[model samples]
Target: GTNDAEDCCLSVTQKPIPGYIVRNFHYLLIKDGCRVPAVVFTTLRGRQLCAPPDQPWVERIIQRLQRTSAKMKRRSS
Candidate 1:
């Protein structure tokens, strides 16, 4: 699942003379038992962090996506 990095990226699209699509580029940190402050970074910009700086739990997100993707593939088959 981690191998599918594209799924984690934000998709952007554009129209040309014909038709085309584009994608834009886009993780967690832990502490000594608790989460360290999260850092948001960009290539053109600097870092911005959450005001209270707490890591958002992502386990539920992973499980939900896994289940949904599996079901989608099963139905397609």
Candidate 2:
């Protein structure tokens, strides 16, 4: 049987989204049967976006998010 893409990514955008408005994130996993394992960025304004996971733009944004989360976690202890 084929997989679903109704709530999944059928396509992706090349332009980078600014991290200031992004609030949450997850992956469209191929192992879970997606069209492509892409970056699913959830924004503060309540929107979903897809970006290619192969490049530095999403990589940079993800690193920023990870860094912030780590910093907050360490200080909270």
Candidate 3:
């Protein structure tokens, strides 16, 4: 596998995850003990991550989205 900095980010993202359409989750583990760690959130076009060490802080955002599940899905066609 390609274990390099390209996969590892320079720093975690403080910005919103509004980059692309995310659906599922995929966590990355450095096989060669690389620098930055990240958690990949399945995007619309492709799979991507937001960058983070532990998933604790990231989980907050997920929970928030989950809470909005009651926001009502697409009804108006």
Candidate 4:
């Protein structure tokens, strides 16, 4: 049985940790640059669900946090 990672639709970090998955890690803006830390998203049971970089929910959370942080910054100013 092949998982999503095997399909090449998503790339994971080298030396995948036991019971945890890493995916879509990118840092530098240019090509052939150091990939960002493997984004690890885990479920309640500690099982990784979506492939890291492709995790829409994670992006959503990031956006939410950014918005909140921006609001705070504005308020503080």
Q: Whole-model Cα lDDT per candidate?
A: 0.27, 0.68, 0.54, 0.38
Residue pairs in steric clash, candidate 4? 26-36, 27-36
Which 10 residues in a row give candidate 2 its minimum summed lDDT?
1-10
Off by over 4 Å in 1: 1-56, 74-77
Write one digit per residue (lDDT tens) for candidate 3, span 1-77.
Answer: 13544654445566536523566444455763555566655466654655463646566655554555447676462
TM-score of each: 0.24, 0.66, 0.41, 0.31
Q: Cα RMSD for candidate 2?
A: 6.1
In angstroms, give how far residue 26 of model 4 lies from its true place. Answer: 12
Residue-wise C-alpha lDDT for candidate 4, range 2-73, written one tens digit per residue: 354331223455433432222222222214333443344443354443234444544554454446456555
TM-score, model 4 to reference: 0.31
Q: TM-score: which is higher, 2 or 3?
A: 2
Q: If both were scored by lDDT, which would come out higher, candidate 2 or candidate 4?
A: 2
| Candidate rank order under TM-score | 2, 3, 4, 1
Deviation of model 4 at 51, angstroms: 8.5
User: After superposing candidate 3, which stretches have Cα over 4 Å from the reference?
Assistant: 1-11, 16-20, 30-32, 53-57, 60-77
Q: Give the Å shift of residue 36 in candidate 4.
A: 3.8
Cα-based lDDT at residue 70, candidate 3: 40
Residue 12 C-alpha lDDT in model 1: 17
